[PDB]
Amino acid sequence: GSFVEMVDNLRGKSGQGYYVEMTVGSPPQTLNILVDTGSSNFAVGAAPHPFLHRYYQRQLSSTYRDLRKGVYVPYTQGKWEGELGTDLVSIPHGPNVTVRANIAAITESDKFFINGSNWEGILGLAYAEIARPDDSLEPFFDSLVKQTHVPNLFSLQLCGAGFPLNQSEVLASVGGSMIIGGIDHSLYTGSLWYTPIRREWYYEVIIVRVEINGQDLKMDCKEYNYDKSIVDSGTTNLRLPKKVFEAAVKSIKAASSTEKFPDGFWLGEQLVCWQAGTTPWNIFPVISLYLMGEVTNQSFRITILPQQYLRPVEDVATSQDDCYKFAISQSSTGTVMGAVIMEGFYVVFDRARKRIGFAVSACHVHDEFRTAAVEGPFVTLDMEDCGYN
């Protein structure tokens, strides 16, 4: 398809998130909203805050409805809480429709709004099962589909720059596209390969094999989905279950041993810097994640480059060095295919057919020698067994 008005409607970067412009209330109050496939609540700052340039003023909206109910959302490092209500919502560079949706007006938060991120709310695109307070609070996308004829699917092309962007550059640049209700062929190359959404809560999938430069990690595949495996645009890193993480890092270190990096680099805590333009991409291996296909006993793989898993960070120093952080870290809640992974591909969240498609992104960062890839099919047996219970 071709949904030209929605192409390039995102701004942001992997470390801080990608967001789309939305309006809430009457008259319209414009806000920048983080696109998050890892959660299911539509929530916006509703009170002044040091890191918010603007916020939702319910008292100024004539269509605001109070649901007289509070909502609390805690997470690893911080949280937000607020008051539930509904209002009219639109997406300026989205389909030309206006919907009444649940809105969590954030009254208090800790380590939620990030300095300089520029988004003032979050758009939880996942399913009702994980919405807060409970699954009766209908998610935004569900209200959108119910109230309009927008097809039940959206697609995301998150575009990392491959280098640090200052405040001015993020504001003045295109960070990608969120095509609501369709697929735009200019956003990818090659073919789209689909993997089933295992269950509708998070956008859960099943990984059946992992390779580091073609070499099989060779772990029992259930380890790869230990707990669950999800696609999450609201998380920066590629997160891996502890056992998988330890095996992956051992292998990545082995492939890159011509250079040694401090432990803090591998812990994703400290940056590594190389003189301008000399980042040794070639010593780092590519990483392939094989996903269960739609055809019985068939699988396909997506391959990412170090240009995806090494996240650019500015060297606040006065050097012209190119610096990065290792964007692969351990998880205790399963595999998380975050932003640095999504930056390599055009990702289709086909809710209507309960599947997620992957294609090489037309804007993925690469070099002259290697490119990210999506290839298949591969004959694979007993993949259902890779799922955890």
Give me the resolution in angstroms, 1 decimal.
Answer: 2.0
Rounded to an integer, what distance in angstroms lies between the CA atom of residue 89 and that of residue 273?
44
In contact, 237 and 329? CB cutoff 8 Å: yes
Longest dimension (CA), the chain: 64
Three-class secondary structure of residue 379 per DSSP: strand
C-alpha span between 196 and 387 (Å, rounded): 12
Which helix or strand (DSSP H or E) is residue 304 part of? strand 298-304
**Method of elucidation:** X-ray
Beta-sheet strands, E only, within 197-233: 204-205, 207-212, 215-216, 229-231
Ranges assigned E (strand) in 28-139: 29-36, 42-45, 65-75, 78-90, 99-110, 121-124
Type of residue at 364: H
Name the DSSP letter for residue 147: H
> Residue 161 carries which side chain, given as an amino acid letter?
A
DSSP for 6-49, please give it.
GTT-EEEETTTEEEEEEEETTTTEEEEEEEETT---EEEE-S--
CA dihedral (209, 215, 220, 225) in degrees, to 10, reads: -40
Q: How far apart are CA 111 and CA 98, in angstroms?
A: 31
Distance CA 14, CA 84 (A): 29
- Asked if 176 and 8 touch (Cβ cutoff 8 Å), the reply is yes
Q: Are 174 and 143 in contact (CB under 8 A)?
A: no
> Phi-psi region for residue 69, left (φ > 0), alpha (ψ -120 to 50) or beta?
beta
Residues with active-site annotation: 36, 232
CA angle 148, 28, 49 (to 5 degrees): 120
The CB density around residue 132, as the number of other CB atoms within 10 Å, is: 18
Domains and CATH numbers, the chain: 18-150 (2.40.70.10), 151-389 (2.40.70.10)
Place of tokens 């975050």: 338
Give the alpha-carbon dihedral of 354, 195, 178, 57, to 10 degrees: 50
Q: How many C-beta atoms surround the C-beta of residue 294 within 10 A?
A: 15
Other Cβ atoms closer than 10 A to 155: 26
Q: What separation in angstroms does the CA of 87 have from each of 45, 66, 130, 135?
A: 14, 9, 22, 19
| Burial of 190 (C-beta count, 10 Å sphere; 0-12/13-18/19+) | middle
From residue 103, give the alpha-carbon distance in Å to each of 30, 73, 231, 352. 14, 14, 24, 24
Q: Residue 53 corresponds to which tokens in the numbers above?
A: 């340039």
Give the count of alpha carbons within 13 A of 232, CB side only.
22
Residue 254's CB is within 10 A of a number of other CB atoms, namely 12
Cβ neighbors of 172 (< 8 A, separation 6 or more) are none
Q: Which two tokens stand for residue 284?
A: 């780092």
Mapped onto helix, strand or coil, the DSSP state of residue 142 is: helix
Rounded Cα distance between 364 and 362, Å, is 6
Q: Please enumerate in sequence order all residues whose Cβ is within 8 A of that of 100, keeping only pairs 6 or more positions apart, or say none.
A: 63, 65, 86, 87, 88, 89, 143, 147
